[PDB]
Design a protein around this ligand. Sequence first.
Ligand SMILES: [Mg+2]
Ligand SMILES: [Mg+2]
Ligand SMILES: [Mg+2]
Ligand SMILES: [Mg+2]
Ligand SMILES: [Mg+2]
Ligand SMILES: [Mg+2]
Ligand SMILES: [Mg+2]
Ligand SMILES: [Mg+2]
Ligand SMILES: [Mg+2]
Ligand SMILES: [Mg+2]
Ligand SMILES: [Mg+2]
Lengths: 81, 87, 150, 206, 96, 54, 97, 217, 129, 25
Amino acid sequence: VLVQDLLHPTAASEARKHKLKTLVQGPRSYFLDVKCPGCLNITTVFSHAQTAVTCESCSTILCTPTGGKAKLSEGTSFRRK
Amino acid sequence: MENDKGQLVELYVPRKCSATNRIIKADDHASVQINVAKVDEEGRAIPGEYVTYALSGYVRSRGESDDSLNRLAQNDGLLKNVWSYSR
Amino acid sequence: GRMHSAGKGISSSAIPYSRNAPAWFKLSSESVIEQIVKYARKGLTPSQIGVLLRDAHGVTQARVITGNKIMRILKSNGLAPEIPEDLYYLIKKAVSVRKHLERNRKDKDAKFRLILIESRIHRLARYYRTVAVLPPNWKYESATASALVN
Amino acid sequence: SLPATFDLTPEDAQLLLAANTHLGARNVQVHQEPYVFNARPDGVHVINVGKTWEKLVLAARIIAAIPNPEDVVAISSRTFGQRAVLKFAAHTGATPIAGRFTPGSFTNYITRSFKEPRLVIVTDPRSDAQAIKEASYVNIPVIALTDLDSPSEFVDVAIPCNNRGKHSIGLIWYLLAREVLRLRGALVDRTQPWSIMPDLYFYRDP
Amino acid sequence: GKGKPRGLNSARKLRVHRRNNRWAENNYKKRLLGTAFKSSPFGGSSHAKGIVLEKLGIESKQPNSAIRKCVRVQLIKNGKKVTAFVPNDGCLNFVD
Amino acid sequence: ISFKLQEEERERKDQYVPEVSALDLSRLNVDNQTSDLVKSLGLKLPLSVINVSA
Amino acid sequence: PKKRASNGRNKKGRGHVKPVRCVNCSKSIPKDKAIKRMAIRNIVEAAAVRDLSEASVYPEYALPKTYNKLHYCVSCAIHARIVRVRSREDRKNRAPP
Amino acid sequence: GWVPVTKLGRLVKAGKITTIEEIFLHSLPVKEFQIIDTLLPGLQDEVMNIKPVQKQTRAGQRTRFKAVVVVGDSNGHVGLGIKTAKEVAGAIRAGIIIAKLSVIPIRRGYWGTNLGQPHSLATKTTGKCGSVTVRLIPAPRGSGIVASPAVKKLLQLAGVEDVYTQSNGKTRTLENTLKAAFVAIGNTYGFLTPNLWAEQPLPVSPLDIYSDEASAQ
Amino acid sequence: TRSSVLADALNAINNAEKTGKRQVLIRPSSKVIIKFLQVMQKHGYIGEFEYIDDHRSGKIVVQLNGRLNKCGVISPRFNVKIGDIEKWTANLLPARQFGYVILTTSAGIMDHEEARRKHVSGKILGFVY
Amino acid sequence: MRAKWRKKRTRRLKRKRRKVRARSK
RNA sequence: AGGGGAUCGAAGAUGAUCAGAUACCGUCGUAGUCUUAACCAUAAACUAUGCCGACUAGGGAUCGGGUGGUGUUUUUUUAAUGACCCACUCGGCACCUUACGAGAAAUCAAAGUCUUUGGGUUCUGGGGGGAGUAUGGUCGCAAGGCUGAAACUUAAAGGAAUUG
RNA sequence: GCGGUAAUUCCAGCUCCAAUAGCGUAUAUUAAAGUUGUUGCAGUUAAAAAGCUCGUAGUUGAACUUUGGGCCCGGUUGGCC
Ligand SMILES: [Mg+2]
Ligand SMILES: [Mg+2]
Ligand SMILES: [Mg+2]
Ligand SMILES: [Mg+2]
Ligand SMILES: [Mg+2]
Ligand SMILES: [Mg+2]
Ligand SMILES: [Mg+2]
Ligand SMILES: [Mg+2]
Ligand SMILES: [Mg+2]
Ligand SMILES: [Mg+2]
Ligand SMILES: [Mg+2]
């Protein structure tokens, strides 16, 4: 193209590129404030939890680990941030 | 280049590529110079007055002179919304 | 990449640009510290403590919330081990392969992998002895190796 | 640097979309993506209709910038582009090369078909690469009626369109010819539609 | 880095590599082993005197066909015997 | 082969137009993103966005 | 000079595959380098079917087929004309027919 | 009686373009040797060598002769011509037209301070044809041409009067060596120098100026 | 592995100029690279360049202007006297009137010309012309 | 003068030469 | 050196075949082929292309992993999961086009970023024979492996491509 | 490479050339040799990437710590009695 905004890449470009190859590299992960139906508490968990997280009341399962993002235990209510 | 007493002593000064700022030498027989005739009201040609762009053969060989004209014409106001600086 | 291989993967954790973090985590830095101390008293390595904090809590990084790192916390309150975690895992890997080899002598692939593991062990141990973490003349004997992993 | 009456007007847009020249190619290469419009499902890409018109106006300015209309060469080698180029010859100067290009026409100064143009316009870069490649030896500006999957080597100016459409090819030549005559003292009234219809720019079978 | 090291403190490696690879040169090898003084009829000398043991007629190599008329002499300094050409038309009557 | 009579009858039979047809309005299946394109360009048209099946 | 970019075989990233003996001359050749041909054939031939079927119980039952994967060496392929040497520019083609 | 066949020929015979510099500036292709002959009346040629060449046939050897010719006034213009033909005289002739058609300029400068006319080259240059690579290095006044005789004559016919040469490869291959030197001197304008850092109005072609006179009917 | 980030930076600039790109992206942007680009920018070989500040080492986006023939590095950083600048410039620079041999001396990063008029010398970094 | 068979010849020569030197040794 | 020895099969037998064959071919057939414990350490051990790192051009296909589609698909109509489709993405085996560039050329996305010659590092070569020989050393039961000349002799040996 | 019956190459005569009170020949060395290589070679096919991996000496090794601005003194081309 010989000319392009390397300083100001398109948001679509930065979204579709790899997390290491962006201009200022950062994670595509996040945190969930997620509601387990067991009790009145809110549990803050990782997106790619890589473990079986659990709370004091719902002390069996909350999300099961996988290769990438952890799969929620099919009854919770998640929210980002 | 000038001699001792001013007096530019150079066998000609060559054109430069408006795209890549490369000198177009004599045997660059793939280099072009495109002329865009001016326009007044009612869309007339008004012959004799041009906007000239020199493209070097190297850029043209790479299939990469079209976007260079897009950038240059967008800069000069020949075109409204043909070139996008960000990508 | 891949010190003792040919693979060229990257597979890294790209931490956020923000050195001050994370605008939603209202727990106190003190309370985080004794959480860290509690899991370490249970007997978890700094890496395991880090993943468990990051999972069960909102602790994005220990060093952005606490003024220092997890190992620095453990050294501060006198719970850091003698052998660093990476070295100890390397030694226990070597111990497992050595026992496997003694049972199966004709595993030349295992013998090759064992040589690679011990070379990684010796390089890491040389570095630790340079930074004076391990005492000078700390050797990986490989005949008293299993006693160092217990 | 041009007046605002040059913009894409609804009647030109109506005839444009009637020709369906907004339909692009299934796959695009890096030099045609400045004209992409976030393709439909089934993979049929669509084109910046405004950019097509704007490049058409710029190419028309190039054509009506050579003092002699009789040393502009229009290359076509496809059955859809034949009649369009011949009518382009009837209305502009624009001498044609239809059917075979007869390799050795810009070089080889002793051929019968030896021409020395100031500007060459090609209907299809892929099927007219012979003219484009030969003109690259003798400095001839190239204006190509490109598609999304078309080569851009030595292509000075590109007007994206649909190259699989007989209506699209004929209408682009019609629009280019109309703007060329408008950019001179032959089509002075630019607001009125030109007296004829692109029906005979369109290639007619058999 | 195309082969050779480029370290500012790698001069030892560079010079020893050159020293080892210098033996492949023909004249350097011959001069450093001193074959001229050991294995040559002349002990590294431009000329040498001798005594004509006999005359010899050597048939020239192909594609030529001629007799070369050399003389087999025996050097004084080394005792080594060698054939020496007698270059001109004639001159075999002068050598005896 | 090309003679003047043949080229003249060719011009006569090429100049013939079949009246007004094939471009007159019959009601343009201008799909939704093209409608978005022309409305971004700010141009009026006979809006007809159709939803094809699978 | 090198004659083929892929030397004569289909082996990149292996270093060894297996030998497979030629069905004609019994030469041991690598399986990737072997010229393999499927021979799907009817049971008898195109003219016997009439008399075979009019003398057959189980009318028009199946006309069974025989299946086998012949492996040829390069020399036998040349000799029996399965490969039929091509030109320098035409040898890069890889289409079956 | 020469009838021009190309637009450049018409605008040259009519006297519209009176200097080679317009052709060079606009990089206009030259297909007629009369054009270069007209614009450079004092264009002298010279023949480097004639070499025999054999093509084996069914019977005997079809033998052709290849001549290399260097042309050019000492004002900074050179051409190089390779031609193979049945007869040596015809080979010399056609090589001279080819050398005329292949005339390109040169960039002269100073090793120097700014004093006098440009004697040496402005920049170190190199060309490479075949395996041969020929390098030209600016030299002070009085050094002369420091080169093998074939390259030295070509440099003299270029008008360079002070230069160092450094050739690598099979320099005994004359045609490759001469072509390499031709490339090296031709690149004297392909190189960019701080004294050429300014901007120019990008003049229109004389073909555009006199389009009417060209293509007479 | 990585041994001379300046070498990689100058190589990237050279490749961009060769293919005609009017800009290049540079990683990992040491302050030596910063000084070296400042010397180019003062002499007009490159235009405006940008330091993108990631918290690890930084990237750089340089705007080129088609005015650079070769920007190179001299590895190793040979120690040069004032009596060696002339031979280094003769070996590297295509002429005597233009081109610069970039040195690192105690007075800082600078070219051969201003090094000579300051009458100091250090190690050699690279060349540009 | 196939190289393998020339290699075989020099190996045969080496064996025989060592054997004939054995009696002197 | 033990076990095992079905098949094939250096040596060999035996039939032909030849001008001859102790060659090709047919039929047998010891060692071997397989395994255990020890030796050997060589292959056109090849991608004839050392390893690490960055940049430079376009494309689709596939493998492993992941991310995102109110995508399709089954079993309860449709859930989850699984399989498939599409777009990204990291890593891998490669492939297609072109000549930016490279090469003596064949060709090469590396064999590019090299007289505009310097990212780091290891190994090897200096016309062809003699010769991987002699000798000395070392390793091996052995066959041999590693190291390794010289005297003398020659004007060529060779690489890629063109015509016949 | 010439010499086998016309030898532009041998033995001679004539003519001519080059250097010149000097000019050949032999051996050694230097440049030519970017055919020893830091500058500055080559290793797919010409001679040459160890079969492959580890690893000590050796060589090499990411980024980062005072930047910038202002004030004064003060040397030089010369620019105009
Ligand atoms: Mg990496
Ligand atoms: Mg062959
Ligand atoms: Mg193998
Ligand atoms: Mg070997
Ligand atoms: Mg090998
Ligand atoms: Mg040598
Ligand atoms: Mg040798
Ligand atoms: Mg060499
Ligand atoms: Mg070979
Ligand atoms: Mg070889
Ligand atoms: Mg290898």
